[PDB]
Design a protein around this ligand. Structure first.
Ligand code: HEM
Ligand code: HEM
Ligand code: HEM
Ligand code: HEM
Ligand SMILES: COc1cc(C=O)c(OCc2cccn3ccnc23)cn1
Lengths: 146, 141, 146, 141
């Protein structure tokens, strides 16, 4: 379901309040904690063996930042998301072979992390808009599987 | 399968919901209906508008069942027997809808109890709701 | 989907032995028995109360032959499975709101049915070819979800 | 969650395996590696080749593992805790792979045991294999 003018305004409004050097790190870190098999994709990243270990790993926070940045891009280019993530699709699908269900999980963890931070400001209607967005990034990301 | 830490995580986290359980049930419900409009086809007889009394009442039922699942976390299949007959035999809910509702419950909790919603507690709660979902979508009678 | 000339020959020879009046009904019947929530889409088929009821239900068989028939059309159009199924994708996705996970399930059920029928003739290489096909077909069903 | 019937079906279907335990185990293995090549990434130390004595010996373990899981179905988590730690803690097997192996086991069974592969038994094996899959992918001790 595409974006109507009201929610477009709503999501971009609160994306501006997002701190761009943490939430990405908490989203990835929570993905690695809540869905631990995803760790396998990061043996290069070192210590991931406990939550607090994960949630402070400088690699993780570092990596997160560029994932959030990837998300920012999709926001700016909703009308054509698959083009945006064309290259990303290739790396994740063709190179690493990440099962695309894992994409959906990360989008939902990011949505959780927006709720954690923004609290009551993350209303059901603003979640509804964001759920449209993340499902776009997950779908665009697996386009090469299709 | 829940670990010892999972169990303690969930019970202390739930105890913090306290008197807001029913309220959190109804909000998770509303979030699911707005976020995932296909789930509405399961409630064709519900008034689904904002502030709906039917949704508020149903939320309380769902919250109370989750509370009882917490009380009975070691023997959930027996404790949830009647709910699995309803959901697995009569309604035949698609399991993907339980993942949507569980996600919305975790969004509600993170929005309302940020200090409780640590990464570890997040994981424990995710496993608990997955376990409840499996029982409710499994025909074991 | 790209099959080799060899898996092409072996798939087509097996399919030429398929009982076009039963295999479809067996695959659907099993889907409904193995994944009971799929029964919600077929309330107008009558008795689905037990496995023996499911498999003997005449509407189940009727609709199974139709579904088997689409998998045939796909087998002659492995090239643009997307186009060949564009209309069918319209139905299950826009009209019917079938969660695309169920498309994978029925293709795998159908794979189990061919194994059941053909035994040792359904070799690992042979199944590998069919997996390619039903992965292809399910993809083209979920094209509109894309 | 398995029903009474389910455990009887799984016992009555998997028992007929018996002698050919290694054979069917190795074949479902091979079925998985050919049909779903990404799954080889967990087996770079194996000889993947057809008829590989390492795949065959492995097949014998998964099957006994599964017969062992059939043997302790009602306390599978305790009975499988060592396999859990292998696959969930040390190997980090993504759970989709368990669905692929479970499919290939069902195919092998349908190919070799048609008279046992009634719709009812197929539903039970699928649940049993989903149950093993959850236990093997969960960190619970
Ligand atoms: C779903 C939304 C996702 C987005 C937007 C995203 C974005 C990105 C980006 C921008 C990179 C750049 C790394 C580079 O330039 O080399 C990357 C790399 C990577 N992604 Fe993701 N990613 C997503 C999902 C996932 C998931 C779910 C996994 C695994 C469970 C994953 C595994 C990886 C790995 C292993 C790398 C490279 C690791 C490294 O550089 O050391 N990705 N991703
Ligand atoms: C946390 C997971 C869930 C729990 C604990 C739960 C709990 C409940 C409870 C306690 C009832 C009332 C039983 C009664 O009044 O006799 C109920 C009814 C119902 N539930 Fe669920 N449910 C869950 C997930 C779902 C999902 C995902 C759906 C559909 C998307 C669903 C659909 C229904 C429906 C349609 C009814 C009938 C309500 C009515 O007709 O008034 N449930 N459920
Ligand atoms: C994955 C491969 C599938 C194929 C090739 C397939 C094929 C078909 C065909 C040929 C039709 C009839 C179109 C017509 O005669 O106009 C149809 C309709 C239908 N399909 Fe399927 N199908 C698939 C999966 C599914 C699944 C998984 C479900 C539900 C879980 C489903 C639910 C339905 C329903 C409800 C109808 C219409 C029934 C009615 O209106 O009476 N399909 N499909
Ligand atoms: C029903 C599902 C499965 C069962 C019952 C099972 C059972 C077993 C058993 C019994 C062992 C050897 C235990 C021992 O050392 O004595 C083993 C090892 C192993 N399994 Fe699994 N397994 C299953 C699924 C999987 C899947 C889906 C994968 C990966 C895609 C996998 C990868 C491995 C690996 C890599 C080993 C190491 C084996 C070795 O080095 O000997 N397993 N499994
Ligand atoms: C339909 O898919 C399912 C169904 C069930 C039931 C399941 O696990 C049950 C289970 C797991 C682990 C431990 N236990 C103790 C008692 N029961 C269990 C997993 N997947």
């Amino acid at each position: 379901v595409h974006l109507t003018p009201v929610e477009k305004s709503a999501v971009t409004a609160l994306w501006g309040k997002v701190n761009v050097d943490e939430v990405g790190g908490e989203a990835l870190g929570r993905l690695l904690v809540v869905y631990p098999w995803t760790q396998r994709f990061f043996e290069s990243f070192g210590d991931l063996s406990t939550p607090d270990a994960v949630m402070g790993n400088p690699k993780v926070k570092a990596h997160g930042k560029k994932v959030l940045g990837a998300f920012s891009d999709g926001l700016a280019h909703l009308d054509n998301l698959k083009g945006t993530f064309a290259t990303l699709s290739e790396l994740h699908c063709d190179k690493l072979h990440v099962d695309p269900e894992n994409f959906r999980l990360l989008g939902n963890v990011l949505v959780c992390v927006l709720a954690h931070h923004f609290g009551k400001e993350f209303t059901p209607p603003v979640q509804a808009a964001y759920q449209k967005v993340v499902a776009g990034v997950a779908n665009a990301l697996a386009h090469k599987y299709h | 399968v829940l670990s010892p830490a999972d169990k303690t995580n969930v019970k202390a986290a739930w105890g913090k919901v306290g008197a807001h359980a029913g309220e959190y049930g109804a909000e998770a419900l509303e979030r699911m209906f707005l976020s995932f409009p296909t789930t509405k086809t399961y409630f064709p007889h519900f008034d689904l508008s904002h502030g709906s009394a039917q949704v508020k009442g149903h939320g309380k039922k769902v919250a109370d069942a989750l509370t009882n699942a917490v009380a009975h976390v070691d023997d959930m299949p027996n404790a949830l027997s009647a709910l699995s007959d309803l959901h697995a035999h009569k309604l035949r809910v698609d399991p993907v809808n339980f993942k949507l509702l569980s996600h919305c419950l975790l969004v509600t909790l993170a929005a309302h109890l940020p200090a409780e919603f640590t990464p570890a507690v997040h994981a424990s709660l995710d496993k608990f709701l997955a376990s409840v979902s499996t029982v409710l979508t499994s025909k074991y009678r």
